[PDB]
């Protein structure tokens, strides 16, 4: 009556007939408190997914808007929009993190460092950066913008 | 009921000139119960494994080139499986999960194949982690061509 869990336990019990190859189907199994922490840990996730998004995306918005190349139309009505294509393809960023509260701002720093890299961002163009703790924040965050090598700036703070 | 044998065994044992001894055990409450649970799944195996015999009997029949008795008058042609596992190979499948008990019914389960004429050199034992490995093991089994029959016994509910 799930419509989820019983398709996937009979695919991979056929899959394992089928080819005569043992397929150990495991899954978790929590209540009430288990939900709790991964409901907790996934929200970290998103939180910082989402921010190195918005990055992506203004990032594409200034270098189109400024640049010189005839953008397409809503649906062939000649209106032409500009918007932030989220293929960080070039861009160069840099993360500033604070210890303070390690445990949770690392979750935040880890969910938006996958986010670039899976949007074709290469590994090499990622600094990160860490201060002990927010005020230290606003002059090492200052000295990475000044480069010209950075297209953007993401600071996680503490709570 | 119970006197009367005593009274025959020291009877025996005086004609005889043997020691003859003869013992009862009195039960409580709680060991009826476990007694009655080893039985239940003993019989579970037996009948398991009865099952098997039957059908592995009706094939032989089935496919063979000689009909036999019609019904409770003629003209209608009957197949079943006769009780005599004679000749045939076994194979069986049980999971360690829950062994303490998985194992009572493959020890209920070869004494029928042994006690309606099978010899134990005939029967093949496979052990599984668990009731989730069942199904592709005894495709394993089944792909022997010395295998007329499988049983398998999971744990679960």
Same mark, same amino acid.
């Given at each position: 009556f799930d419509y989820n869990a019983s398709v996937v336990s009979?695919?991979?019990?056929?899959?394992? &007939?089928?080819?005569?190859?043992?397929?150990?189907?495991?899954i978790?199994?929590?209540?009430?408190?288990?939900?709790?922490?991964?409901?907790?840990?996934?929200?970290?996730?998103?939180?910082?997914?989402?921010?190195?998004?918005?990055?992506?995306?203004?990032?594409?918005?200034?270098?189109?808007?400024?640049?010189?190349?005839?953008?397409?139309?809503?649906?062939?009505?000649?209106?032409?929009?500009?918007?932030?294509? &989220?293929?960080?393809? @070039? &861009?160069?960023?840099?993360?500033?993190?604070?210890?303070?509260?390690?445990?949770?701002?690392?979750?935040?720093?880890?969910?938006?460092?996958?986010?670039?890299?899976?949007?074709?961002?290469?590994?090499? /163009?990622?600094? &990160?950066?860490?201060?002990?703790?927010?005020?230290?924040?606003?002059?090492?965050?200052?000295?990475?913008?000044?480069?010209?090598?950075? /297209?953007?700036?993401?600071?996680? @703070?503490?709570?």
């Open positions: 009979k695919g991979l019990a056929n899959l394992s &007939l089928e080819l005569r190859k043992p397929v150990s189907f495991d978790i199994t929590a209540d009430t408190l288990e939900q709790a922490i991964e409901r907790a840990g996934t929200k970290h996730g998103n939180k910082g997914w989402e921010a190195a998004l918005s990055a992506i995306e203004m990032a594409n918005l200034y270098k189109s808007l400024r640049g010189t190349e005839h953008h397409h139309h809503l649906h062939g009505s000649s209106i032409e929009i500009y918007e932030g294509k &989220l293929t960080a393809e @070039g &861009l160069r960023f840099g993360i500033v993190a604070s210890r303070f509260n390690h445990t949770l701002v690392d979750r935040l720093v880890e969910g938006a460092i996958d986010c670039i890299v899976r949007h074709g961002g290469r590994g090499e /163009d990622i600094t &990160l950066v860490r201060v002990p703790g927010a005020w230290e924040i606003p002059v090492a965050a200052d000295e990475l913008a000044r480069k010209e090598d950075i /297209d953007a700036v993401i600071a996680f @703070g503490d709570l």
